[PDB]
């Protein structure tokens, strides 16, 4: 590579071809894997010159090389991205979205994705400068298959950054504007486009129920459920995230997920060899068992209660904690017959085993579930049978020990249980 000093001499030469050669040299320096000298390039004052080269319509090579150099400065820290924005790059890149040269308009898409990806303020500023209409215009083709794969992947990722981040969430009118295009990308056949479309949907559904409703109304749940069964882990992860977000919403929003057949995929998700997939699938289950009694019944009907017993029995501890929540939700909302069923599936022994955890919150969750199960047992007059079960698999030992526990709610719920049933 060139030195930064030589790049500066070329860029300050006032000879457009010398400036092109030095901009290309900078692009190569900034494209190296180990520690590209971004700050040295910023300190040398080169950003405003790069930004002015974005406007040289008669020299499309220097437009491309500067766009690439600025993309890579903006891919850095927030302070580095700020230096690019402060140089005037946002309106200059938006102008380039119209370039007749596909490789230049693509580089402008990529640069705007890095700027918007910095955070909600720069995402919103990219939107205020008018990026959404020209971005969407690049995808206004009858069939996405006619576009180059790399080009489409970059556009999808850039749109996902316009969906990303909270405090605030993206402007409602901007979301409404992008969503039809996002739904087309969600039906495309390329694995990377599908993964970034799912991530964008997972960001739009990460928020209040009004934001979930905007997405659900576009009819995407069936396609998300199909992507839940993809063989590519990079697709399953965000598709499950988005479905999990959606079932944190109203009971009607949760019912769309069940109606689209999502629960049939959960035997595999709840046994997935990727720990994070098991964890988020169990989290999703816990929000479904916080639903209506007819939604609990669908969990039962799909055979999923043995799978919750299994994850409660053996899983990463974080997954076991989501399974505990799923059990407490189930027993808090369920009918007596549904709670009887849960006990017949074997829930008591793995519940009791988890009471040796050194995590105060899971103990509270488990003691809540035990109390809910006892309350069901009182309506059957079978509290005595339950106490025996709980003693026989070692739970009474631990419940008694928890009377001596430091946390207040723990020893209180613990003492109550023994006074009332033991």
């Amino acid at each position: 590579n060139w030195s930064v000093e030589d790049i500066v001499k070329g860029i300050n030469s006032n000879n457009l071809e010398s400036q092109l050669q030095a901009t290309q040299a900078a692009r190569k320096l900034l494209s190296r894997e180990k520690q590209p000298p971004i700050d040295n390039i910023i300190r040398a004052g080169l950003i405003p010159k790069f930004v002015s080269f974005l406007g040289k319509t008669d020299c499309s090579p220097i437009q491309f090389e500067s766009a690439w150099a600025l993309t890579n400065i903006a891919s850095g820290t927030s302070e580095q991205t700020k230096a690019v924005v402060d140089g005037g790059a946002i309106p200059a890149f938006i102008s380039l979205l119209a370039s007749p040269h596909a490789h230049i308009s693509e580089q402008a898409v990529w640069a705007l994705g890095n700027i918007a990806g910095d955070g909600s303020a720069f995402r919103d500023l990219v939107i205020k400068h008018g990026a959404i209409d020209p971005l969407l215009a690049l995808l206004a083709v009858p069939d996405l298959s006619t576009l180059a794969c790399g080009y489409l992947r970059n556009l999808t990722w850039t749109l996902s950054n316009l969906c990303r981040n909270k405090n605030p969430a993206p402007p409602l009118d901007a979301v409404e504007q992008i969503l039809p295009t996002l739904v087309r990308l969600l039906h495309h056949n390329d694995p990377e486009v599908l993964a970034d479309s799912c991530w964008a949907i997972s960001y739009l559904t990460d928020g209040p129920n009004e934001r979930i409703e905007m997405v659900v109304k576009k009819g995407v749940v069936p396609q998300l459920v199909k992507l839940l069964g993809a063989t590519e882990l990079p697709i399953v992860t965000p598709a499950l995230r988005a479905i999990g977000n959606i079932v944190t919403g109203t009971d009607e929003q949760t019912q769309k997920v069940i109606d689209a057949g999502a629960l049939a995929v959960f035997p595999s998700l709840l046994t997935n060899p990727k720990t994070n997939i098991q964890k988020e699938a169990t989290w999703t289950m816990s929000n479904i068992t916080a639903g209506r009694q007819d939604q609990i019944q669908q969990v039962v009907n799909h055979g999923l209660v043995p799978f919750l017993v299994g994850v409660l029995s053996k899983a990463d501890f974080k997954t076991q904690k989501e399974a505990a929540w799923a059990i407490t939700n189930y027993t808090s909302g369920g009918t007596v017959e549904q709670i009887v069923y849960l006990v017949h599936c074997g829930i008591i022994e793995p519940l009791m085993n988890l009471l040796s955890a050194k995590d105060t919150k899971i103990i509270q969750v488990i003691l809540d579930a035990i109390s809910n199960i006892f309350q069901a047992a009182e309506k059957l007059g079978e509290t005595e049978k339950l106490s025996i079960m709980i003693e026989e698999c070692g739970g009474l030992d631990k419940i008694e020990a928890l009377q001596r526990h430091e946390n207040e709610s723990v020893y209180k719920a613990s003492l109550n249980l023994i006074e009332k049933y033991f």
Partner: peptide, 22 residues
């Protein structure tokens, strides 16, 4: 009541920035 939103960190989301290496 009962529903629990998931609080994610940056590491649990797709990367927000990408440099072009070639």
């Amino acid at each position: 009541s009962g529903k629990r939103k998931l609080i994610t960190s940056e590491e649990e989301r797709s990367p927000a920035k990408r440099g072009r290496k070639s």
